[PDB]
Write an enzyme that holds these catalytic residues in place. Sequence first.
Site, PDB file in Angstrom:
ATOM      1  N   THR D   1       0.810  -1.221   0.000  1.00  0.00           N
ATOM      2  CA  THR D   1       0.000   0.000   0.000  1.00  0.00           C
ATOM      3  C   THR D   1       0.849   1.280   0.000  1.00  0.00           C
ATOM      4  O   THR D   1       1.993   1.270   0.448  1.00  0.00           O
ATOM      5  CB  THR D   1      -0.936   0.010   1.219  1.00  0.00           C
ATOM      6  OG1 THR D   1      -1.630  -1.243   1.283  1.00  0.00           O
ATOM      7  CG2 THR D   1      -1.953   1.133   1.135  1.00  0.00           C
TER       8      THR D   1
HETATM    9  C1  LIG Z   1      -7.054 -10.152   0.299  1.00  0.00           C
HETATM   10  C2  LIG Z   1      -6.351  -9.896   1.630  1.00  0.00           C
HETATM   11  C3  LIG Z   1      -4.830  -9.869   1.498  1.00  0.00           C
HETATM   12  C4  LIG Z   1      -4.221  -8.691   2.252  1.00  0.00           C
HETATM   13  O1  LIG Z   1      -4.690  -8.336   3.280  1.00  0.00           O
HETATM   14  N1  LIG Z   1      -3.064  -7.999   1.722  1.00  0.00           N
HETATM   15  C5  LIG Z   1      -2.543  -6.885   2.486  1.00  0.00           C
HETATM   16  C6  LIG Z   1      -1.121  -7.113   2.988  1.00  0.00           C
HETATM   17  O2  LIG Z   1      -0.249  -6.868   1.920  1.00  0.00           O
HETATM   18  C7  LIG Z   1      -2.630  -5.600   1.676  1.00  0.00           C
HETATM   19  O3  LIG Z   1      -3.106  -5.615   0.590  1.00  0.00           O
HETATM   20  N2  LIG Z   1      -2.123  -4.375   2.260  1.00  0.00           N
HETATM   21  C8  LIG Z   1      -2.190  -3.109   1.561  1.00  0.00           C
HETATM   22  C9  LIG Z   1      -3.298  -2.337   2.291  1.00  0.00           C
HETATM   23  C10 LIG Z   1      -4.692  -2.302   1.661  1.00  0.00           C
HETATM   24  C11 LIG Z   1      -5.246  -3.701   1.412  1.00  0.00           C
HETATM   25  C12 LIG Z   1      -5.645  -1.547   2.586  1.00  0.00           C
HETATM   26  C13 LIG Z   1      -0.886  -2.351   1.849  1.00  0.00           C
HETATM   27  O4  LIG Z   1      -0.842  -1.716   2.850  1.00  0.00           O
HETATM   28  C14 LIG Z   1       0.354  -2.430   0.935  1.00  0.00           C
HETATM   29  C15 LIG Z   1       1.621  -2.808   1.721  1.00  0.00           C
HETATM   30  O5  LIG Z   1       1.680  -2.217   2.998  1.00  0.00           O
HETATM   31  C16 LIG Z   1       0.140  -3.505  -0.133  1.00  0.00           C
HETATM   32  O6  LIG Z   1      -0.669  -2.991  -1.151  1.00  0.00           O
END
Ligand SMILES: CCCC(=O)N[C@@H](CO)C(=O)N[C@@H](CC(C)C)C(=O)C(CO)CO
Lengths: 249, 244, 241, 196, 243, 204, 221, 231
Positions: D1
Amino acid sequence: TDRYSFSLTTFSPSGKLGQIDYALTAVKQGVTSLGIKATNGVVIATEKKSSSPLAMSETLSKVSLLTPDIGAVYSGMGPDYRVLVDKSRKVAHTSYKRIYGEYPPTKLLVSEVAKIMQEATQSGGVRPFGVSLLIAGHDEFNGFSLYQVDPSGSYFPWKATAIGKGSVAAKTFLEKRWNDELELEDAIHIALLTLKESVEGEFNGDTIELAIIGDENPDLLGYTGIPTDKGPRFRKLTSQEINDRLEAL
Amino acid sequence: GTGYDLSNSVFSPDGRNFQVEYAVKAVENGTTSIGIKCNDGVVFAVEKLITSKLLVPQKNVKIQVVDRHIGCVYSGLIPDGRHLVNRGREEAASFKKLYKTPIPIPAFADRLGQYVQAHTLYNSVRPFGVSTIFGGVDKNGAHLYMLEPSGSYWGYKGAATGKGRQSAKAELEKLVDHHPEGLSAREAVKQAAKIIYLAHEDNKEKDFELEISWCSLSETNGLHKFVKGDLLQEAIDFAQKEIN
Amino acid sequence: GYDRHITIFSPEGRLYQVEYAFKATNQTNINSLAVRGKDCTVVISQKKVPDKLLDPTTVSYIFCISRTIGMVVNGPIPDARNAALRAKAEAAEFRYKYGYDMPCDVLAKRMANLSQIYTQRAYMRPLGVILTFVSVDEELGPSIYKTDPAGYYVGYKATATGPKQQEITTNLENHFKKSKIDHINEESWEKVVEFAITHMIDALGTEFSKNDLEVGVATKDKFFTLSAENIEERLVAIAEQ
Amino acid sequence: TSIMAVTFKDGVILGADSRTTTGAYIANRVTDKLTRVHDKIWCCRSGSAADTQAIADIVQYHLELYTSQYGTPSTETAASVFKELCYENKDNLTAGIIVAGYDDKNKGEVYTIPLGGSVHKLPYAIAGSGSTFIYGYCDKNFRENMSKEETVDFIKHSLSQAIKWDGSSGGVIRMVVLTAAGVERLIFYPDEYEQL
Amino acid sequence: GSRRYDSRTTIFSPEGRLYQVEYALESISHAGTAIGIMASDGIVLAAERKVTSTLLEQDTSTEKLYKLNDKIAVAVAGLTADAEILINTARIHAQNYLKTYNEDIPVEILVRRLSDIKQGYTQHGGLRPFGVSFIYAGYDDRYGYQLYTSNPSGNYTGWKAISVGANTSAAQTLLQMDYKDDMKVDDAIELALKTLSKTTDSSALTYDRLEFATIRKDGEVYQKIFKPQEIKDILVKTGITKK
Amino acid sequence: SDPSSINGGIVVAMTGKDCVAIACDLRLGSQSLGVSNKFEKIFHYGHVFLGITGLATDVTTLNEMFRYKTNLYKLKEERAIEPETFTQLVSSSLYERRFGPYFVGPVVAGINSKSGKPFIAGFDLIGCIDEAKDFIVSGTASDQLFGMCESLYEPNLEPEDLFETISQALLNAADRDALSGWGAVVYIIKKDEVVKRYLKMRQD
Amino acid sequence: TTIVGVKFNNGVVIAADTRSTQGPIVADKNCAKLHRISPKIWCAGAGTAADTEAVTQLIGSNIELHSLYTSREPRVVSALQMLKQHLFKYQGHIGAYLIVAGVDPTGSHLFSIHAHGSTDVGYYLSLGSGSLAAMAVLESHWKQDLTKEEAIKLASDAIQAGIWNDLGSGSNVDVCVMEIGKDAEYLRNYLTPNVREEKQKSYKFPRGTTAVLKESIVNIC
Amino acid sequence: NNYDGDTVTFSPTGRLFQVEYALEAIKQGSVTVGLRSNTHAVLVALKRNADELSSYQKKIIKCDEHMGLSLAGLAPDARVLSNYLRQQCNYSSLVFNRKLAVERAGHLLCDKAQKNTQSYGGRPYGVGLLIIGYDKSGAHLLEFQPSGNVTELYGTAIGARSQGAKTYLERTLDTFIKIDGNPDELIKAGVEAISQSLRDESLTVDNLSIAIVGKDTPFTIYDGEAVAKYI
Ligand SMILES: CCCC(=O)N[C@@H](CO)C(=O)N[C@@H](CC(C)C)C(=O)C(CO)CO
Ligand SMILES: CCCC(=O)N[C@@H](CO)C(=O)N[C@@H](CC(C)C)C(=O)C(CO)CO
Ligand SMILES: [Mg+2]
Ligand SMILES: [Mg+2]
Ligand SMILES: [Mg+2]
Ligand SMILES: [Mg+2]
Ligand SMILES: [Mg+2]
């Protein structure tokens, strides 16, 4: 704190359980409600006594679905009946559907609500329920059935009966008008005729509540594609159907 | 039938809870205590009945503080007032812990009101034998509240309870009628001293000690402080001049 | 004897504590009514401030339960605030657990179930309050639902509560028999507020100033309460009627 | 993210990407990481999607109850609720939150709750896996009391760089503008910001 | 507090009697008569339905006779709902014994467990006792055919023949008159029907007003709950009704 | 080691024309050591048959539990439980111990007394219903049983032929499993008749 | 597993394969992975099959009770919130990955829920082992404003991609269409691309082939 | 009278009869006096005996090196209250390295006692306590009643015939308030006060208990021959 950890319903020296008799008295002052079992369905009816004409009658629904094949009506204290139907709907799932995948037979759900009421006549710091219920249901291995459940927790199966103010008169009518060769339409007709004596005011679809446990209604299922999913047998009659059946008396 | 007044939370045939009214009787037999909401704060005052000269003066404090901005005074059973203040302190602590900001005066009033009213729902507990005048300054300004043994509370321009509650109230109303623009903080302090001296006449047999606190946005920076020292003596002298 | 003190059955099948709580509902001597518009619901209540030492703005019997549900209480203010806090908690918990705003009738049913519990369990006394919930439900439109100490609850085309309840009820019944509809055929909520105030002045036979009324309006996705100035605007506009 | 929140003269603006990843696979490329916990109090979520969703739901419940009882809550109060949830459950949570709010007394406010449950009030906050690549850029380009247009451009450039370098950030750039005028939703597509 | 409303259901009378137990026995005295008879090769249970009407369904009705397991049944006199509570607990205890020992529960053990459950309410808890008396008819390998009774006091006794409910004195006198030890199960059926017909309060004894059950013997024990048609047949066979 | 592979054993059910068949091996062992030649893994409650493979103690415990539950069911409902309802009951009972599971692999087989339709079903250790109208396999030799059934099975077999089919499947699967065999039992179940046969197989 | 969901102009369709595997072994060749939460709220499950069936049955029971209590048609967001909170309580130990679609008074809705409790919104979603193949199809063919037939074709094609290219998916294609105003349409085995070819021999044995040691009648009466 | 059944019943007058009966249980207790100056605080206790063969019951209880109390009434309830006070002082010393102020101890006793006047089941404590202590604010003397009302005084007395000592201290106030740095004279004033509350008795070695706390004097109790010099 809750210091009422003792029975509020005890035996009098004559042997009576006073609170149970007084709850039955409270039932006797309730609006007349009746049930009639036919060979192809069961009918349950009651009067929709509204206190103020400003009150919307449709929200005050005295007939309540318990399972797609089991419905209920009452005579007595409305709120007790409402919390009882909520408990019954819940126990139908927790104690049966979540265990066997199918809804419970009418007798078993009736015995569960009877157990609730009996707890109310013996648990600490509680009065019995001030209602009597008529449960009309259908299950695969017992067919159609009509049961009556009292504040004491006693339940009995009736070919037809009534409870409330006009109970005695209505039951006499039913006794002299019921036969084992009766049809669902004939039973609806007899129920309307019996209510006509217990209702002094206006007598139309708007003032009476009538429901049946008849054949399965696939149009009331909401989805198609499962041949085993036949549909709900409980159907509440609309005001228009009640009026159409009243005009031909 | 009879016996409706023997248990708490029992409705009488006219819809009353007689135990709460007996608690109010217990309140009326208490010392006088008043609160005056001024333009930018509130002032609380109380009469302390000096039963004997063996009492250490300036000790035996009655005015209590909740958080750093709420002042509470009560008339009736002093221990019930202390219990209610302890509960209110717990409420303010939890509110600060969760929402960071100090608890607003209306929120605190509702906490106290729900607590007191809950004490009128069961026969296993006795209603509170105090009436409480409390308040202070929050982000929306100054607030004064009075809370009854029934759990009823309201916001007041001025409040009084105890024996001399009648006279005090009258005096308070005169204030409200004479200057509707409001009193300043120090003016309200002197006037509260005057009103306590006047309401002491219903207990003129025994000597009394005045006790004043205030929570002003300008004079105390929103904090609750006891009026002591030169300002307290000034208010006492103003009261002496107003009685004679 | 003791069957008159706890919520148990008298030999006549009656719960005297429930009846005495109903009596306690009229302790405040305040009347209120609720009416439905084309797309709004108005509640007017009397505003009686007896003490000159009282802050009139804090003297209220109308509560903002949720962003869509308003509640006017007929009864003592301690039990009123008790029920109001409970209703706010239940509405918030409903929105959290089921992902949509609690419907007016569902909140009415919840409070009515709690009242029924109070009338069946002996340790808790009934609340001496009558709760009128108003909203503009996303599935039912303008909705008025009332709950009483007995655990009973029901919806209304319009309603009134208080000592002079029956007089306002009769006035509304007559207006709706004449009008042949179950609501006020007005588009703006201001006109419905005007209608409600007019019919309360006609039924009670007393005039109202801006400090004598409490007005709560529920519109789609909002419930608010009018200020003294907004009520004064409504009254001034009534003057021409 | 990759998430950020920037205060400016008229209020605050929250920005986020739209990429939810399960490893190197993009589980969702249109994710809305800007979550409303109150009318003019929003948050940017980073970390465990489930954890952030649960925390935001519980904070929204708490703020709804708080509003029903005591009125509109300050942004600091929402930050405090987030902080209590993240700190008292630090052992089982993987959530980095940026709470941005607008009120009339304080204009815009930005708080950041990293891992461990501390809270920090900042003129702007960056967070998420991609924020690491824009620390120097944002520090060299941010100015106090910017206009709405300059703030949108600042967020757009910062998040475009973060998306360019972080493989775990991508998709569209979402923004939420909180001002006295209310809530405005902005979206910027890859073909727009990739040429910046 | 609430101590003024506590009726104190588990106290002694100055004569050493339990008020609630005595009043519940008086309550049961108005319940429909139930009779059990133990012959040398079977057991018979009969009972009269207090609830009677033309509109009462009998095919689906079970008010007085209940199955506990496949070798033990009960005749009920009193509050049917308390009876169902106790019957559910008894069925559960029988199935517990089966799961633990892989053998059917001996009749006296089940009766004693149910009697202990009854007695508990008369010593602690401050609750009312169960207004139900039971007649247990059972079979086990240790004692053969067994007939027991249990009243709200928690006391239980073993009988060759016994009656509970209404007109227990008359029924007991009649049974003591006409009972012989070496009789067979059919003679016991006849005797039970005769006692019920002689102690009934109604005009005539019909099939619709009574429930009947037999635990008899293939080397196995069969438990038969009589259907309305079987009841009518046995009534016309014993000469109480015609056709 | 692995609780479902300690005792060994196999159960297999098939459907034919208006009949079902359910067979099990007879061996109970502790890893290589074989202990009991008479450990039947098929039980019946009324007319519904349940075969249980896996941990022997759990097989016995589940048998006693389902006897308990079906006896209470018959007492409350005054009728024997049906195979589909009993299947749902087994699923719910297994999932009740979701995080402390019984190490079993149940198989339900029976004729619905009211509809006459044959019915078999299978579950894993946490109660996942596998509705298959042809055959259900379970046990240590589940792969061998899968191959034997997928090859030998054809629908709508008379009992005398369904017996041969299921018996050959069970025997040849058990011959290639170290922890199964030592005898076998086969129930051929029609609506009004149930036949139980002990097979002759290799004793190694 | 391979499950997908596609929103079209007047509703939403979900689709799934019918293969259930225990490791490399095909346990069920026609598993029904489309579960009915409410008459117009359906959802397809992937992962631990027992967990998906159990969580859907539980949330459907609670949704039915909730609808009886509130006297309203159940809302898809209600099922979504209940499922997400129940899954989050178990920190992913209930390995259920659901695609929940339906229609309610507020319109048509399509969401996904992962075992850890995270929920996602989209116009087309895929889950299971074949999700990557199906999603390839979706990203290649989905467009705004699909017809009922266009959406059914797209969903069935995604499930087919998962069937052919993913080893964990196979056999038939189950579909459930849900239009706004109409009843839910549950097409069991909407397609059957894999049907076992006729065998070369009948392996029926001559009676008497199997040696029997002892025979007896069983009493089930 | 139907309003004296428990502590949860207000009388129509607004009274709590069980609290009044606990106060009357005090008034039936033996006499004890307390007084203080600016540097010291003294408790004098005439302990009652059951008869001539009996032991004059322990009437002064130490709570910490800087604080103690004397009792009048039900000795068990005074044991309970003194143990609670000991635990509170101990908590202060352990958690805060802080000697518990006497005013705070009075507040804690007030709350502990009030908890019994509002809940069904249980009773108010049937004791009155005179609490002396020297802390960072100087010497302190407190009177505690079962109602929960705790009041700080220069001197007071509780028990049977306590009004004699009360009026004596009321007259002798300006005298004993200035006995700073001479514990013997303060003890003599307290003994004269407690003598003013005798009707058909006279202080002896067996029935006298003294307790002293002060600037450089930890809470000490003198019993037996130790008090002979003050008779
Ligand atoms: C389907 C469930 C899988 C899941 O939970 N993936 C997490 C952990 O990677 C994720 O997608 N985290 C994002 C945050 C968003 C989703 C609000 C993020 O913070 C970045 C790295 O920090 C990555 O895009
Ligand atoms: C019954 C045997 C035990 C079991 O739970 N098998 C699981 C995974 O081994 C399984 O069949 N999962 C399917 C989901 C359906 C069956 C609901 C799936 O999701 C894909 C891959 O994601 C696999 O085909
Ligand atoms: Mg009550
Ligand atoms: Mg990238
Ligand atoms: Mg082998
Ligand atoms: Mg070998
Ligand atoms: Mg494949």
